[PDB]
Amino acid sequence: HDKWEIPRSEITLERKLGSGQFGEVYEGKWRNYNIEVAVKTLKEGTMSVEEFLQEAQIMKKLKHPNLVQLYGVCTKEPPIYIITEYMSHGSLLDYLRDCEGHTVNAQALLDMAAQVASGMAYLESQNFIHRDLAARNCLVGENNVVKVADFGLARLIAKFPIKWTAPEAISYNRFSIKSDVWAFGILLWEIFTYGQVPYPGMSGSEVIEQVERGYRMPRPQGCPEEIYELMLQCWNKSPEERPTFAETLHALETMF
Ligand SMILES: Nc1ncnc2c1ncn2[C@@H]1O[C@H](COP(=O)(O)OP(=O)(O)CP(=O)(O)O)[C@@H](O)[C@H]1O
Questions:
Q1: Which residues are catalytic?
Q2: CATH topology of domain 87-256
Q3: Could you give the CA distance from residue 24 to residue 43 in angstroms, rounded to a whole number?
Q4: To test the ligand 1 pocket, which listed residue (26, 71, 91, 150) has its Cβ within 8 A of the most ligand atoms?
Q5: 85: exposed, middle or buried (C-beta count within 10 Å: 0-12, 13-18, 19+)?
Q6: Phi-psi group of 72: left, alpha or beta (phi > 0 → left; psi -120 to 50 → alpha; rest → beta)
Q7: 1-86 is classed CATH 3.40.1440.10
Q8: Closest Cα to atom 13, ligand 1: which residue?
Q9: CB neighbours (10 Å) of residue 159?
Q10: How many whole angstroms separate alpha carbon 99 and alpha carbon 97?
Q11: Is any ligand 1 atom within 6 A of the Cβ of residue 15?
Q12: Ligand 1 centroid to 111 CA: how many Å?
């Protein structure tokens, strides 16, 4: 019924970007300003409107230069659309692996890691928990602005992927901003290894076991001691002795 409602006539849709698990993506064009957009769409026997849109409902309440921006929605009838700013280099994961991002230096990696921090710190200070933070869920636009995306599992103040999830969250579903910091830790590993998959080789059953028992991935060669020292900080056995996003950010802004 509401104020973010965009008429469907106004959006075109020009090409496909994403798969069909509950609905695909597509680049489109918003005719009334001649700007590109990402349209997320809903495969029609699934989810429920409510469950699709809470991702929107969260974005409605956010404004920040490293948080992908909601333009609006077409819930007038099906398929449901969630319209958002188009990011010209796709997931951070991809960017690091392919387009340009493969061949860049450690200062590039750092400053793109600070933008994620910056966005997260804003979420922190607004009492939000993302819950699904990783490189695949971060996007890239022009001049390598990096933004944070996917607020599907986001909340104010349940299934999951083992390797980005903190041991307390795995064992007890105690999820919090500090579990989000754990993930940032993993993200950092991903960045500084030009998009590698974490805990190489291990089952995911091995990982639950090993990390609850104290194990942490070794420093990978390429990565500034400084940064590795910071990963470990985010991987602190105990939630409440991990940095705030505030502190994390500040750290990154120091450093050669
Ligand atoms: N707003 C946006 N702008 C530009 N590209 C986007 C975008 N949203 C998604 N994409 C691109 O399409 C991909 C689709 O991501 P999405 O989460 O929709 O499906 P997916 O195939 O990646 C399954 P998963 O959620 O496990 O990553 C992204 O990784 C990204 O490259």
A1: 132
A2: Transferase(Phosphotransferase); domain 1 (1.10.510)
A3: 8
A4: 91
A5: middle
A6: left
A7: no
A8: 18
A9: 4
A10: 7
A11: no
A12: 22
Q: Would you kindly state where each structural domain of the chain is located, as residue ranges?
A: 1-86, 87-256
End-to-end CA distance of the chain: 51
Establish whether domains 1-86 and 87-256 are of one fold. no
Tokens of 219: 């420093």
What's the CA-to-centroid distance between 38 and ligand 1, angstroms? 9
Return the DSSP state at 101: G
Q: Write out 221-253 in H/E/C secondary structure.
A: CCCCHHHHHHHHHHCCCCHHHCCCHHHHHHHHH
Structure tokens at 4: 């973010």
Please tell me if the CB atom of residue 84 comes closer than 6 angstroms to any atom of ligand 1. yes
Q: How was this structure determined?
A: X-ray
